[PDB]
Design a protein around this motif. Structure first.
Motif, short mmCIF file in Angstrom:
data_model
loop_
_atom_site.label_atom_id
_atom_site.label_comp_id
_atom_site.label_asym_id
_atom_site.label_seq_id
_atom_site.Cartn_x
_atom_site.Cartn_y
_atom_site.Cartn_z
N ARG A 44 0.84 -1.17 0.00
CA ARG A 44 0.00 0.00 0.00
C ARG A 44 0.90 1.26 0.00
O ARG A 44 1.95 1.27 0.64
N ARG A 49 -2.48 1.00 -4.34
CA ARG A 49 -1.92 -0.34 -4.23
C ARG A 49 -0.78 -0.55 -5.26
O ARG A 49 -0.87 -0.08 -6.41
N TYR B 3 2.88 -1.50 3.94
CA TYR B 3 2.76 -0.17 3.36
C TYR B 3 4.11 0.49 3.30
O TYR B 3 5.03 0.10 4.03
#
Ligand SMILES: C=Cc1cc[n+](C)n1C
Lengths: 156, 39
Positions: A44, A49, B3
């Motif tokens: 992410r 994405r 992330y």
């Protein structure tokens, strides 16, 4: 998400708190890291994405959003810089003269610098600021110290 | 769920801290991407 060129931390919230599992390089719209950092999982970047595009367990490399873009190579003579990005700490440049890994398939540069596992994927640069490989796949030698290969992919 | 977060620019720093030795090692690379010392 953030697509600006540079060095990035790779984080997870699966474990306790927010944990840094590695580091990578954004260049020409492609995110580059070592396979053992993400295991090929999607990433992410803000609300966006990043999907894996190429990877290889043996080379221990993976690229996201496009093919591997980094193609500079260590010249075999000059000092280089590890742009270490340790967990919870500021990015810092460390200059060093690489050693060599001699293998049956040829020789590879190696840096003898020891950082936490979460620093894997940090870029090694030449004097022009080009990324000549990623730090974090290596070996533990006789006196217990860590030596990383300078791992570089192929630009198709 | 992984992330990414920007940590900096990729540039060479003039007068960075200089350290580390330069060992020459014979190594083997297995199919799982693990390096090991050859003796
Ligand atoms: C990036 C550093 C690293 C990777 C594997 N080990 C054992 N270490 C210290």
């Amino acid at each position: 998400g953030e697509t600006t060129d540079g060095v990035y931390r790779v984080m997870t919230r699966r474990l306790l708190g927010s944990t840094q599992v590695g580091v990578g390089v954004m260049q020409e719209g492609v995110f580059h890291t070592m396979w053992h950092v993400t295991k090929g999982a999607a990433l992410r970047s803000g609300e966006g994405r990043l999907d894996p595009y190429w990877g290889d367990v043996k080379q221990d490399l993976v690229s996201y959003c496009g093919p591997w873009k980094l193609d500079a190579a260590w010249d075999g003579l000059s000092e280089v810089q590890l742009l270490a990005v340790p967990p919870g700490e500021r990015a810092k440049n460390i200059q060093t003269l690489p050693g060599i890994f001699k293998t049956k398939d040829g020789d590879i540069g190696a840096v003898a610098l020891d950082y936490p596992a979460g620093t894997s994927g940090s870029p090694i640069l030449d004097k022009c600021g080009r990324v000549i490989g990623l730090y974090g796949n290596g070996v533990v030698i006789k006196n217990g110290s860590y030596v990383s290969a300078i791992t570089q992919g192929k630009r198709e | 769920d992984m992330y990414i977060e920007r940590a900096g620019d990729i540039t060479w720093e003039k007068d960075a801290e200089v350290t580390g030795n330069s060992p020459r090692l014979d190594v083997a690379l297995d199919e799982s991407g693990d390096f090991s010392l050859v003796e």
